[PDB]
Enzyme design. Sequence first.
Site, PDB file in Angstrom:
ATOM      1  N   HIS A 179      15.439  25.280   3.732  1.00 21.29           N
ATOM      2  CA  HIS A 179      15.297  24.615   5.000  1.00 21.29           C
ATOM      3  C   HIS A 179      14.329  25.612   5.717  1.00 21.29           C
ATOM      4  CE1 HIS A 179      14.477  21.881   8.262  1.00 21.29           C
ATOM      5  NE2 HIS A 179      15.617  21.272   8.165  1.00 21.29           N
ATOM      6  N   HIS A 182      10.932  22.412  10.683  1.00 17.99           N
ATOM      7  CA  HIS A 182      11.595  21.813  11.637  1.00 17.99           C
ATOM      8  C   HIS A 182      12.315  22.758  12.777  1.00 17.99           C
ATOM      9  CE1 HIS A 182      12.470  17.955   8.698  1.00 17.99           C
ATOM     10  NE2 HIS A 182      10.845  18.335   9.223  1.00 17.99           N
ATOM     11  N   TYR A 184      14.021  25.468  12.956  1.00 23.33           N
ATOM     12  CA  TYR A 184      15.167  26.031  12.358  1.00 23.33           C
ATOM     13  C   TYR A 184      14.897  27.700  12.037  1.00 23.33           C
ATOM     14  CZ  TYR A 184      16.885  21.514  12.898  1.00 23.33           C
ATOM     15  OH  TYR A 184      17.254  20.240  13.436  1.00 23.33           O
TER      16      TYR A 184
HETATM   17  N1  LIG Z   1      18.116  18.956   9.890  1.00 20.58           N
HETATM   18  C1  LIG Z   1      16.914  18.690  10.357  1.00 20.58           C
HETATM   19  O1  LIG Z   1      15.744  19.226   9.791  1.00 20.58           O
HETATM   20  C2  LIG Z   1      16.798  17.436  11.657  1.00 20.58           C
HETATM   21  C3  LIG Z   1      17.917  16.959  12.189  1.00 20.58           C
HETATM   22  C4  LIG Z   1      17.446  15.866  13.091  1.00 20.58           C
HETATM   23  C5  LIG Z   1      16.223  15.384  13.410  1.00 20.58           C
HETATM   24  N2  LIG Z   1      15.225  15.838  12.476  1.00 20.58           N
HETATM   25  C6  LIG Z   1      13.871  15.493  12.942  1.00 20.58           C
HETATM   26  O2  LIG Z   1      13.309  15.931  13.931  1.00 20.58           O
HETATM   27  C7  LIG Z   1      12.859  14.768  14.542  1.00 20.58           C
HETATM   28  C8  LIG Z   1      13.048  14.787  15.908  1.00 20.58           C
HETATM   29  O3  LIG Z   1      14.199  13.823  16.376  1.00 20.58           O
HETATM   30  P1  LIG Z   1      14.923  13.465  17.561  1.00 20.58           P
HETATM   31  O4  LIG Z   1      15.295  12.134  17.757  1.00 20.58           O
HETATM   32  O5  LIG Z   1      16.149  14.573  17.505  1.00 20.58           O
HETATM   33  O6  LIG Z   1      14.067  13.842  18.511  1.00 20.58           O
HETATM   34  P2  LIG Z   1      13.793  13.042  19.947  1.00 20.58           P
HETATM   35  O7  LIG Z   1      15.325  12.842  20.643  1.00 20.58           O
HETATM   36  O8  LIG Z   1      12.870  13.755  20.974  1.00 20.58           O
HETATM   37  O9  LIG Z   1      13.023  11.687  19.605  1.00 20.58           O
HETATM   38  C9  LIG Z   1      13.831  10.295  19.502  1.00 20.58           C
HETATM   39  C10 LIG Z   1      12.526   9.434  19.994  1.00 20.58           C
HETATM   40  O10 LIG Z   1      13.467   8.021  19.435  1.00 20.58           O
HETATM   41  C11 LIG Z   1      13.916   7.299  20.420  1.00 20.58           C
HETATM   42  N3  LIG Z   1      15.331   7.439  20.430  1.00 20.58           N
HETATM   43  C12 LIG Z   1      15.988   8.508  20.231  1.00 20.58           C
HETATM   44  N4  LIG Z   1      17.329   8.464  20.620  1.00 20.58           N
HETATM   45  C13 LIG Z   1      17.644   7.322  21.237  1.00 20.58           C
HETATM   46  C14 LIG Z   1      18.690   6.496  21.660  1.00 20.58           C
HETATM   47  N5  LIG Z   1      19.687   7.221  21.862  1.00 20.58           N
HETATM   48  N6  LIG Z   1      18.415   5.323  22.359  1.00 20.58           N
HETATM   49  C15 LIG Z   1      16.960   4.803  22.204  1.00 20.58           C
HETATM   50  N7  LIG Z   1      16.022   5.511  21.756  1.00 20.58           N
HETATM   51  C16 LIG Z   1      16.427   6.634  21.273  1.00 20.58           C
HETATM   52  C17 LIG Z   1      13.413   7.665  21.685  1.00 20.58           C
HETATM   53  O11 LIG Z   1      12.156   6.714  22.004  1.00 20.58           O
HETATM   54  C18 LIG Z   1      12.772   8.977  21.650  1.00 20.58           C
HETATM   55  O12 LIG Z   1      11.741   9.251  22.078  1.00 20.58           O
HETATM   56  C19 LIG Z   1      13.310  13.501  13.921  1.00 20.58           C
HETATM   57  O13 LIG Z   1      12.473  12.565  13.936  1.00 20.58           O
HETATM   58  C20 LIG Z   1      13.852  14.049  12.534  1.00 20.58           C
HETATM   59  O14 LIG Z   1      12.479  13.948  11.636  1.00 20.58           O
HETATM   60  C21 LIG Z   1      15.454  17.125  11.747  1.00 20.58           C
HETATM   61  C1  LIG Z   2      18.635  11.029  11.069  1.00 22.02           C
HETATM   62  C2  LIG Z   2      17.645  11.772  10.467  1.00 22.02           C
HETATM   63  C3  LIG Z   2      18.277  13.165   9.815  1.00 22.02           C
HETATM   64  C4  LIG Z   2      17.496  13.941   9.417  1.00 22.02           C
HETATM   65  N1  LIG Z   2      18.173  15.009   8.941  1.00 22.02           N
HETATM   66  C5  LIG Z   2      17.119  16.314   8.157  1.00 22.02           C
HETATM   67  C6  LIG Z   2      17.671  17.385   7.710  1.00 22.02           C
HETATM   68  O1  LIG Z   2      18.851  17.402   7.747  1.00 22.02           O
HETATM   69  N2  LIG Z   2      16.837  18.423   7.105  1.00 22.02           N
HETATM   70  C7  LIG Z   2      15.465  17.998   7.177  1.00 22.02           C
HETATM   71  O2  LIG Z   2      14.631  18.721   6.553  1.00 22.02           O
HETATM   72  N3  LIG Z   2      14.874  16.780   7.511  1.00 22.02           N
HETATM   73  C8  LIG Z   2      15.562  15.909   8.213  1.00 22.02           C
HETATM   74  N4  LIG Z   2      15.181  14.611   8.636  1.00 22.02           N
HETATM   75  C9  LIG Z   2      14.003  14.326   8.520  1.00 22.02           C
HETATM   76  C10 LIG Z   2      13.972  13.634   7.022  1.00 22.02           C
HETATM   77  O3  LIG Z   2      14.047  14.460   6.035  1.00 22.02           O
HETATM   78  C11 LIG Z   2      12.751  13.024   6.519  1.00 22.02           C
HETATM   79  O4  LIG Z   2      11.432  13.953   6.491  1.00 22.02           O
HETATM   80  C12 LIG Z   2      12.015  12.102   7.468  1.00 22.02           C
HETATM   81  O5  LIG Z   2      13.027  11.118   7.893  1.00 22.02           O
HETATM   82  C13 LIG Z   2      10.929  11.115   6.773  1.00 22.02           C
HETATM   83  O6  LIG Z   2      10.396  10.044   7.401  1.00 22.02           O
HETATM   84  P1  LIG Z   2      10.894   8.673   7.188  1.00 22.02           P
HETATM   85  O7  LIG Z   2      12.325   8.654   7.871  1.00 22.02           O
HETATM   86  O8  LIG Z   2       9.798   7.515   7.664  1.00 22.02           O
HETATM   87  O9  LIG Z   2      10.684   8.508   5.559  1.00 22.02           O
HETATM   88  C14 LIG Z   2      16.085  13.883   9.135  1.00 22.02           C
HETATM   89  C15 LIG Z   2      15.496  12.478   9.773  1.00 22.02           C
HETATM   90  C16 LIG Z   2      16.435  11.554  10.383  1.00 22.02           C
HETATM   91  C17 LIG Z   2      15.711  10.318  10.956  1.00 22.02           C
END
Ligand SMILES: NC(=O)c1ccc[n+]([C@@H]2O[C@H](COP(=O)([O-])OP(=O)(O)OC[C@H]3O[C@@H](n4cnc5c(N)ncnc54)[C@H](O)[C@@H]3O)[C@@H](O)[C@H]2O)c1
Ligand SMILES: Cc1cc2nc3c(=O)[nH]c(=O)nc-3n(C[C@H](O)[C@H](O)[C@H](O)COP(=O)(O)O)c2cc1C
Length: 358
Positions: A179, A182, A184
Amino acid sequence: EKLFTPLKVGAVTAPNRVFMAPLTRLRSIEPGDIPTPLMGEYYRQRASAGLIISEATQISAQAKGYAGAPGLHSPEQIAAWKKITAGVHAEDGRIAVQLWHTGRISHSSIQPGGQAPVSASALNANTRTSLRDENGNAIRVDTTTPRALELDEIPGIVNDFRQAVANAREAGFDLVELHSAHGYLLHQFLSPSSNQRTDQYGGSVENRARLVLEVVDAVCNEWSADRIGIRVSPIGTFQNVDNGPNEEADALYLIEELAKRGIAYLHMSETGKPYSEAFRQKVRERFHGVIIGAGAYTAEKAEDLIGKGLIDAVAFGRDYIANPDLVARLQKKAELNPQRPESFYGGGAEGYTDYPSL
Ligand SMILES: NC(=O)c1ccc[n+]([C@@H]2O[C@H](COP(=O)([O-])OP(=O)(O)OC[C@H]3O[C@@H](n4cnc5c(N)ncnc54)[C@H](O)[C@@H]3O)[C@@H](O)[C@H]2O)c1
Ligand SMILES: Cc1cc2nc3c(=O)[nH]c(=O)nc-3n(C[C@H](O)[C@H](O)[C@H](O)COP(=O)(O)O)c2cc1C
Protein backbone atom coordinates in the site's frame (compact mmCIF):
# COMPACT_ATOMS: atom_id res chain seq x y z
CA GLU A 1 -15.48 -8.39 -24.99
CA LYS A 2 -12.04 -8.61 -23.41
CA LEU A 3 -13.00 -7.94 -19.80
CA PHE A 4 -13.75 -11.63 -19.36
CA THR A 5 -10.60 -13.17 -20.83
CA PRO A 6 -7.81 -14.64 -18.72
CA LEU A 7 -4.77 -12.72 -17.53
CA LYS A 8 -1.57 -13.92 -15.95
CA VAL A 9 -0.64 -11.79 -12.94
CA GLY A 10 2.81 -12.86 -11.74
CA ALA A 11 2.47 -16.20 -9.98
CA VAL A 12 -1.25 -16.53 -10.65
CA THR A 13 -3.62 -16.52 -13.58
CA ALA A 14 -6.92 -14.69 -13.25
CA PRO A 15 -9.92 -16.19 -15.15
CA ASN A 16 -11.06 -12.62 -15.96
CA ARG A 17 -10.12 -8.91 -15.52
CA VAL A 18 -12.78 -7.97 -12.91
CA PHE A 19 -10.76 -7.50 -9.72
CA MET A 20 -12.06 -6.67 -6.26
CA ALA A 21 -10.22 -3.55 -4.95
CA PRO A 22 -8.87 -3.38 -1.42
CA LEU A 23 -11.76 -2.32 0.84
CA THR A 24 -11.26 -1.37 4.49
CA ARG A 25 -14.43 -2.55 6.29
CA LEU A 26 -13.29 -2.45 9.88
CA ARG A 27 -15.02 -5.55 11.21
CA SER A 28 -12.01 -7.25 12.86
CA ILE A 29 -11.81 -8.34 16.46
CA GLU A 30 -10.24 -6.09 19.03
CA PRO A 31 -8.11 -6.64 20.90
CA GLY A 32 -5.75 -8.35 18.50
CA ASP A 33 -6.95 -7.02 15.15
CA ILE A 34 -8.08 -10.47 14.16
CA PRO A 35 -9.91 -11.45 11.00
CA THR A 36 -13.18 -13.36 11.50
CA PRO A 37 -15.12 -16.10 9.78
CA LEU A 38 -17.62 -13.45 8.84
CA MET A 39 -14.83 -11.73 6.93
CA GLY A 40 -14.16 -15.18 5.55
CA GLU A 41 -17.74 -15.56 4.31
CA TYR A 42 -17.56 -12.06 2.81
CA TYR A 43 -14.42 -12.87 0.72
CA ARG A 44 -15.66 -16.34 -0.21
CA GLN A 45 -18.85 -14.68 -1.59
CA ARG A 46 -16.71 -12.72 -4.02
CA ALA A 47 -14.34 -15.47 -5.08
CA SER A 48 -15.42 -15.28 -8.78
CA ALA A 49 -13.32 -12.17 -8.96
CA GLY A 50 -10.40 -12.41 -11.37
CA LEU A 51 -8.44 -11.44 -8.23
CA ILE A 52 -9.47 -10.50 -4.72
CA ILE A 53 -7.36 -7.78 -3.04
CA SER A 54 -7.98 -7.69 0.74
CA GLU A 55 -8.60 -4.71 2.90
CA ALA A 56 -5.40 -2.92 4.02
CA THR A 57 -3.76 -5.02 6.70
CA GLN A 58 -1.23 -3.79 9.30
CA ILE A 59 2.32 -5.05 8.89
CA SER A 60 2.75 -4.42 12.64
CA ALA A 61 0.84 -3.10 15.68
CA GLN A 62 2.63 0.14 15.14
CA ALA A 63 1.12 0.17 11.58
CA LYS A 64 -2.41 0.41 13.01
CA GLY A 65 -4.37 3.65 12.43
CA TYR A 66 -8.00 2.41 12.36
CA ALA A 67 -9.91 0.52 15.03
CA GLY A 68 -11.09 -2.66 13.33
CA ALA A 69 -8.52 -3.05 10.50
CA PRO A 70 -6.95 -6.52 10.62
CA GLY A 71 -3.23 -7.26 11.15
CA LEU A 72 -0.84 -9.83 9.73
CA HIS A 73 1.89 -9.80 12.39
CA SER A 74 0.65 -12.23 15.06
CA PRO A 75 0.05 -16.01 15.13
CA GLU A 76 -3.60 -15.30 16.06
CA GLN A 77 -3.84 -13.17 12.94
CA ILE A 78 -1.99 -15.57 10.64
CA ALA A 79 -4.12 -18.53 11.73
CA ALA A 80 -7.34 -16.56 11.20
CA TRP A 81 -6.24 -15.43 7.72
CA LYS A 82 -5.23 -18.98 6.80
CA LYS A 83 -8.83 -20.05 7.15
CA ILE A 84 -10.01 -17.09 5.02
CA THR A 85 -7.55 -17.79 2.19
CA ALA A 86 -8.42 -21.48 2.38
CA GLY A 87 -12.11 -20.60 1.86
CA VAL A 88 -11.38 -18.48 -1.20
CA HIS A 89 -9.22 -21.26 -2.58
CA ALA A 90 -11.99 -23.81 -2.05
CA GLU A 91 -14.15 -21.58 -4.27
CA ASP A 92 -11.32 -21.55 -6.85
CA GLY A 93 -10.56 -17.87 -6.19
CA ARG A 94 -7.26 -15.95 -5.80
CA ILE A 95 -6.51 -13.50 -2.99
CA ALA A 96 -3.76 -10.91 -2.49
CA VAL A 97 -3.20 -9.21 0.85
CA GLN A 98 -2.71 -5.42 0.73
CA LEU A 99 -0.17 -4.45 3.38
CA TRP A 100 0.15 -0.99 4.93
CA HIS A 101 1.59 1.08 7.64
CA THR A 102 -0.86 3.98 8.16
CA GLY A 103 1.86 6.37 9.38
CA ARG A 104 0.38 9.69 10.41
CA ILE A 105 -3.17 8.62 9.60
CA SER A 106 -3.74 7.13 13.03
CA HIS A 107 -4.56 8.08 16.63
CA SER A 108 -2.35 7.84 19.72
CA SER A 109 -5.18 6.11 21.55
CA ILE A 110 -4.76 3.00 19.41
CA GLN A 111 -0.91 3.00 19.23
CA PRO A 112 1.38 0.83 21.38
CA GLY A 113 1.84 2.72 24.68
CA GLY A 114 -0.57 5.43 23.66
CA GLN A 115 2.31 6.98 21.74
CA ALA A 116 2.22 9.39 18.80
CA PRO A 117 2.18 7.60 15.42
CA VAL A 118 5.16 7.93 13.10
CA SER A 119 5.71 9.53 9.72
CA ALA A 120 8.44 10.97 7.48
CA SER A 121 8.00 14.33 9.29
CA ALA A 122 6.10 15.91 12.20
CA LEU A 123 3.01 17.18 10.40
CA ASN A 124 -0.61 16.50 11.06
CA ALA A 125 -2.39 14.62 8.31
CA ASN A 126 -5.12 17.18 8.90
CA THR A 127 -7.78 14.52 8.19
CA ARG A 128 -9.71 11.86 10.10
CA THR A 129 -9.33 8.14 10.81
CA SER A 130 -11.96 5.71 12.00
CA LEU A 131 -12.04 4.61 15.64
CA ARG A 132 -14.57 2.76 17.79
CA ASP A 133 -16.72 4.12 20.59
CA GLU A 134 -17.56 2.38 23.84
CA ASN A 135 -20.31 0.49 22.09
CA GLY A 136 -17.81 -0.58 19.41
CA ASN A 137 -19.47 1.44 16.69
CA ALA A 138 -17.22 3.18 14.19
CA ILE A 139 -16.61 6.95 14.68
CA ARG A 140 -14.54 9.46 12.70
CA VAL A 141 -11.82 11.19 14.73
CA ASP A 142 -9.19 13.89 14.08
CA THR A 143 -5.74 12.37 13.57
CA THR A 144 -2.85 12.68 16.00
CA THR A 145 0.29 14.70 15.15
CA PRO A 146 3.02 12.25 14.25
CA ARG A 147 6.56 11.79 15.40
CA ALA A 148 9.11 11.97 12.57
CA LEU A 149 10.94 8.64 12.23
CA GLU A 150 14.55 8.64 13.36
CA LEU A 151 16.91 7.64 10.55
CA ASP A 152 17.93 4.54 12.42
CA GLU A 153 14.31 3.35 12.72
CA ILE A 154 13.85 2.95 9.00
CA PRO A 155 15.42 -0.53 8.74
CA GLY A 156 12.86 -1.62 11.33
CA ILE A 157 10.09 -0.47 8.97
CA VAL A 158 11.59 -2.25 5.96
CA ASN A 159 11.97 -5.40 8.08
CA ASP A 160 8.30 -5.17 9.12
CA PHE A 161 7.18 -5.30 5.46
CA ARG A 162 9.55 -8.23 4.86
CA GLN A 163 8.21 -10.20 7.83
CA ALA A 164 4.59 -9.33 7.01
CA VAL A 165 5.31 -10.72 3.54
CA ALA A 166 6.70 -13.97 4.94
CA ASN A 167 3.51 -14.10 7.06
CA ALA A 168 1.43 -13.54 3.94
CA ARG A 169 3.02 -16.56 2.33
CA GLU A 170 2.56 -18.57 5.54
CA ALA A 171 -1.16 -17.55 5.68
CA GLY A 172 -1.97 -18.67 2.14
CA PHE A 173 -2.31 -15.44 0.06
CA ASP A 174 -1.36 -15.77 -3.58
CA LEU A 175 0.12 -12.21 -3.85
CA VAL A 176 1.03 -9.16 -1.82
CA GLU A 177 0.01 -5.64 -2.64
CA LEU A 178 2.19 -2.93 -1.11
CA HIS A 179 0.00 0.00 0.00
CA SER A 180 2.02 2.97 -1.36
CA ALA A 181 -1.00 5.25 -2.01
CA HIS A 182 -3.70 7.31 -0.27
CA GLY A 183 -1.38 9.23 2.02
CA TYR A 184 -0.34 6.30 4.22
CA LEU A 185 3.27 5.75 5.36
CA LEU A 186 4.95 4.94 2.06
CA HIS A 187 3.09 7.77 0.34
CA GLN A 188 3.89 10.11 3.25
CA PHE A 189 7.51 9.53 2.20
CA LEU A 190 6.81 9.90 -1.49
CA SER A 191 5.15 13.33 -1.14
CA PRO A 192 6.95 16.66 -0.85
CA SER A 193 3.85 17.81 1.04
CA SER A 194 4.30 15.38 3.91
CA ASN A 195 8.05 14.75 3.60
CA GLN A 196 10.33 17.57 4.84
CA ARG A 197 13.27 15.41 5.95
CA THR A 198 16.78 16.63 5.14
CA ASP A 199 18.39 13.22 5.43
CA GLN A 200 18.71 10.75 2.53
CA TYR A 201 15.00 9.99 2.87
CA GLY A 202 13.98 13.59 2.03
CA GLY A 203 14.37 16.20 -0.72
CA SER A 204 14.89 14.94 -4.23
CA VAL A 205 12.40 12.51 -5.82
CA GLU A 206 15.08 9.81 -5.63
CA ASN A 207 15.30 10.50 -1.87
CA ARG A 208 11.55 10.51 -1.35
CA ALA A 209 11.17 7.21 -3.23
CA ARG A 210 14.08 5.48 -1.35
CA LEU A 211 11.90 3.94 1.39
CA VAL A 212 9.37 2.48 -0.98
CA LEU A 213 12.11 1.08 -3.24
CA GLU A 214 13.98 -0.55 -0.32
CA VAL A 215 10.64 -2.14 0.71
CA VAL A 216 10.17 -3.43 -2.80
CA ASP A 217 13.66 -4.97 -2.87
CA ALA A 218 13.35 -6.46 0.62
CA VAL A 219 10.11 -8.18 -0.30
CA CYS A 220 11.31 -9.35 -3.74
CA ASN A 221 14.21 -11.06 -1.87
CA GLU A 222 11.92 -12.35 0.82
CA TRP A 223 9.49 -14.01 -1.61
CA SER A 224 9.49 -13.16 -5.31
CA ALA A 225 8.89 -10.22 -7.66
CA ASP A 226 6.24 -12.50 -9.22
CA ARG A 227 4.32 -12.25 -5.91
CA ILE A 228 4.57 -8.50 -5.39
CA GLY A 229 2.18 -5.80 -6.58
CA ILE A 230 2.12 -2.14 -5.50
CA ARG A 231 -0.67 0.40 -5.26
CA VAL A 232 0.17 4.02 -6.08
CA SER A 233 -2.03 7.17 -6.23
CA PRO A 234 0.54 9.41 -7.97
CA ILE A 235 -1.73 11.93 -9.72
CA GLY A 236 -3.73 14.35 -7.65
CA THR A 237 -4.67 14.58 -3.96
CA PHE A 238 -5.63 11.80 -1.58
CA GLN A 239 -6.61 12.34 2.01
CA ASN A 240 -4.72 15.69 2.00
CA VAL A 241 -1.52 14.26 0.61
CA ASP A 242 -0.89 15.71 -2.81
CA ASN A 243 1.84 14.60 -5.17
CA GLY A 244 3.89 17.80 -5.23
CA PRO A 245 4.67 20.26 -8.06
CA ASN A 246 5.86 17.81 -10.81
CA GLU A 247 3.58 14.85 -10.04
CA GLU A 248 3.62 13.43 -13.52
CA ALA A 249 7.41 13.31 -13.92
CA ASP A 250 7.78 12.05 -10.34
CA ALA A 251 5.35 9.26 -11.11
CA LEU A 252 7.28 8.20 -14.22
CA TYR A 253 10.44 8.21 -12.08
CA LEU A 254 9.02 5.76 -9.51
CA ILE A 255 7.43 3.69 -12.24
CA GLU A 256 10.74 3.28 -14.11
CA GLU A 257 12.42 2.17 -10.88
CA LEU A 258 9.54 -0.23 -10.21
CA ALA A 259 9.96 -1.73 -13.61
CA LYS A 260 13.60 -2.53 -12.88
CA ARG A 261 12.52 -4.92 -10.15
CA GLY A 262 10.22 -6.77 -12.59
CA ILE A 263 7.34 -6.95 -10.05
CA ALA A 264 3.94 -8.56 -11.01
CA TYR A 265 1.74 -5.50 -11.20
CA LEU A 266 1.24 -1.72 -10.96
CA HIS A 267 -2.15 -0.86 -9.43
CA MET A 268 -3.00 2.82 -10.14
CA SER A 269 -5.66 4.28 -7.93
CA GLU A 270 -7.37 7.17 -9.59
CA THR A 271 -9.69 9.91 -8.52
CA GLY A 272 -10.36 16.25 -9.70
CA LYS A 273 -8.46 15.69 -13.00
CA PRO A 274 -8.55 12.51 -15.20
CA TYR A 275 -5.46 10.77 -16.59
CA SER A 276 -4.45 11.99 -20.03
CA GLU A 277 -4.00 9.17 -22.53
CA ALA A 278 -0.63 10.77 -23.16
CA PHE A 279 0.34 10.04 -19.55
CA ARG A 280 -1.27 6.60 -19.65
CA GLN A 281 0.86 5.71 -22.68
CA LYS A 282 3.98 6.83 -20.88
CA VAL A 283 3.17 4.52 -17.97
CA ARG A 284 2.57 1.56 -20.33
CA GLU A 285 5.88 2.39 -22.02
CA ARG A 286 7.94 2.27 -18.84
CA PHE A 287 6.30 -0.54 -16.96
CA HIS A 288 6.18 -4.02 -18.48
CA GLY A 289 4.05 -5.84 -15.94
CA VAL A 290 0.32 -6.01 -15.32
CA ILE A 291 -1.42 -2.58 -15.11
CA ILE A 292 -4.57 -2.41 -12.94
CA GLY A 293 -6.75 0.74 -13.00
CA ALA A 294 -9.29 1.69 -10.34
CA GLY A 295 -11.26 4.73 -9.17
CA ALA A 296 -14.83 5.26 -10.33
CA TYR A 297 -14.32 2.82 -13.19
CA THR A 298 -17.20 1.45 -15.25
CA ALA A 299 -17.29 -1.82 -17.14
CA GLU A 300 -17.38 0.32 -20.29
CA LYS A 301 -14.43 2.60 -19.32
CA ALA A 302 -12.54 -0.58 -18.46
CA GLU A 303 -13.44 -2.26 -21.70
CA ASP A 304 -12.13 0.79 -23.58
CA LEU A 305 -8.70 1.25 -21.85
CA ILE A 306 -8.09 -2.48 -21.95
CA GLY A 307 -8.83 -2.75 -25.65
CA LYS A 308 -6.64 0.34 -26.07
CA GLY A 309 -3.90 -1.65 -24.33
CA LEU A 310 -3.42 0.96 -21.65
CA ILE A 311 -4.34 -1.18 -18.63
CA ASP A 312 -4.83 -4.93 -18.24
CA ALA A 313 -7.51 -5.09 -15.58
CA VAL A 314 -9.75 -3.06 -13.34
CA ALA A 315 -10.52 -3.19 -9.64
CA PHE A 316 -14.06 -2.23 -8.58
CA GLY A 317 -14.60 -1.03 -5.05
CA ARG A 318 -18.12 0.02 -4.13
CA ASP A 319 -19.70 -2.26 -6.78
CA TYR A 320 -17.87 -5.18 -5.14
CA ILE A 321 -19.06 -4.16 -1.76
CA ALA A 322 -22.64 -4.43 -3.06
CA ASN A 323 -22.44 -7.28 -5.64
CA PRO A 324 -20.79 -10.59 -4.56
CA ASP A 325 -21.30 -11.85 -8.06
CA LEU A 326 -20.25 -8.66 -9.77
CA VAL A 327 -18.50 -10.74 -12.44
CA ALA A 328 -21.67 -12.49 -13.61
CA ARG A 329 -23.64 -9.22 -13.55
CA LEU A 330 -21.17 -7.37 -15.68
CA GLN A 331 -21.30 -10.14 -18.29
CA LYS A 332 -25.11 -10.39 -18.33
CA LYS A 333 -25.35 -6.65 -18.18
CA ALA A 334 -27.58 -7.19 -15.11
CA GLU A 335 -28.71 -4.40 -12.75
CA LEU A 336 -26.52 -4.02 -9.60
CA ASN A 337 -27.77 -3.90 -6.00
CA PRO A 338 -28.06 -0.43 -4.45
CA GLN A 339 -25.04 0.45 -2.28
CA ARG A 340 -25.38 0.89 1.50
CA PRO A 341 -22.65 3.48 2.42
CA GLU A 342 -23.79 3.81 6.03
CA SER A 343 -22.49 0.28 6.60
CA PHE A 344 -19.24 0.43 4.58
CA TYR A 345 -17.39 0.86 7.91
CA GLY A 346 -17.83 -1.15 11.12
CA GLY A 347 -20.76 -3.26 12.22
CA GLY A 348 -21.47 -6.89 11.38
CA ALA A 349 -23.06 -8.95 8.61
CA GLU A 350 -25.64 -6.25 7.72
CA GLY A 351 -24.36 -4.40 4.67
CA TYR A 352 -21.43 -6.85 4.57
CA THR A 353 -22.48 -10.50 3.75
CA ASP A 354 -26.17 -9.78 3.03
CA TYR A 355 -25.98 -8.34 -0.46
CA PRO A 356 -27.58 -11.07 -2.62
CA SER A 357 -26.28 -12.55 -5.89
CA LEU A 358 -28.26 -12.97 -9.10
N1 LIG B 1 -7.35 1.91 3.34
C1 LIG B 1 -7.49 2.94 2.50
O1 LIG B 1 -6.54 3.17 1.49
C2 LIG B 1 -8.67 3.90 2.58
C3 LIG B 1 -9.61 3.87 3.61
C4 LIG B 1 -10.78 4.66 3.52
C5 LIG B 1 -11.04 5.42 2.39
N2 LIG B 1 -10.12 5.42 1.37
C6 LIG B 1 -10.30 6.24 0.17
O2 LIG B 1 -10.23 7.58 0.66
C7 LIG B 1 -11.27 8.34 0.08
C8 LIG B 1 -11.71 9.37 1.10
O3 LIG B 1 -12.82 8.78 1.72
P1 LIG B 1 -13.52 9.45 3.02
O4 LIG B 1 -15.00 9.26 2.91
O5 LIG B 1 -12.81 8.93 4.22
O6 LIG B 1 -13.18 11.01 2.76
P2 LIG B 1 -14.32 12.13 3.03
O7 LIG B 1 -15.00 11.73 4.29
O8 LIG B 1 -13.71 13.48 3.07
O9 LIG B 1 -15.42 12.14 1.85
C9 LIG B 1 -16.70 11.60 2.05
C10 LIG B 1 -17.75 12.30 1.21
O10 LIG B 1 -18.79 11.35 1.12
C11 LIG B 1 -19.98 11.79 1.72
N3 LIG B 1 -20.07 11.19 3.06
C12 LIG B 1 -19.04 10.66 3.79
N4 LIG B 1 -19.55 10.28 4.99
C13 LIG B 1 -20.87 10.58 5.03
C14 LIG B 1 -21.85 10.39 5.99
N5 LIG B 1 -21.55 9.88 7.18
N6 LIG B 1 -23.15 10.78 5.71
C15 LIG B 1 -23.47 11.36 4.51
N7 LIG B 1 -22.48 11.53 3.56
C16 LIG B 1 -21.21 11.14 3.81
C17 LIG B 1 -19.85 13.30 1.94
O11 LIG B 1 -20.53 13.99 0.91
C18 LIG B 1 -18.35 13.54 1.90
O12 LIG B 1 -18.01 14.71 1.21
C19 LIG B 1 -12.38 7.32 -0.19
O13 LIG B 1 -13.21 7.75 -1.24
C20 LIG B 1 -11.64 6.04 -0.52
O14 LIG B 1 -11.45 5.91 -1.92
C21 LIG B 1 -8.97 4.69 1.46
C1 LIG C 1 -15.28 1.90 1.95
C2 LIG C 1 -13.97 1.94 1.19
C3 LIG C 1 -12.79 1.37 1.70
C4 LIG C 1 -11.58 1.43 1.00
N1 LIG C 1 -10.44 0.82 1.51
C5 LIG C 1 -9.26 0.88 0.78
C6 LIG C 1 -8.09 0.25 1.25
O1 LIG C 1 -8.09 -0.38 2.34
N2 LIG C 1 -6.93 0.32 0.48
C7 LIG C 1 -6.92 1.02 -0.73
O2 LIG C 1 -5.89 1.09 -1.39
N3 LIG C 1 -8.07 1.61 -1.21
C8 LIG C 1 -9.23 1.53 -0.46
N4 LIG C 1 -10.37 2.12 -0.96
C9 LIG C 1 -10.33 2.72 -2.32
C10 LIG C 1 -10.77 1.46 -3.17
O3 LIG C 1 -9.80 0.41 -3.24
C11 LIG C 1 -11.09 1.69 -4.64
O4 LIG C 1 -9.98 2.21 -5.30
C12 LIG C 1 -12.21 2.70 -4.91
O5 LIG C 1 -13.31 2.34 -4.13
C13 LIG C 1 -12.51 2.59 -6.40
O6 LIG C 1 -13.57 3.39 -6.75
P1 LIG C 1 -14.99 2.66 -7.02
O7 LIG C 1 -15.54 2.40 -5.66
O8 LIG C 1 -15.89 3.58 -7.84
O9 LIG C 1 -14.74 1.44 -7.83
C14 LIG C 1 -11.55 2.06 -0.23
C15 LIG C 1 -12.71 2.62 -0.74
C16 LIG C 1 -13.90 2.56 -0.04
C17 LIG C 1 -15.12 3.22 -0.63
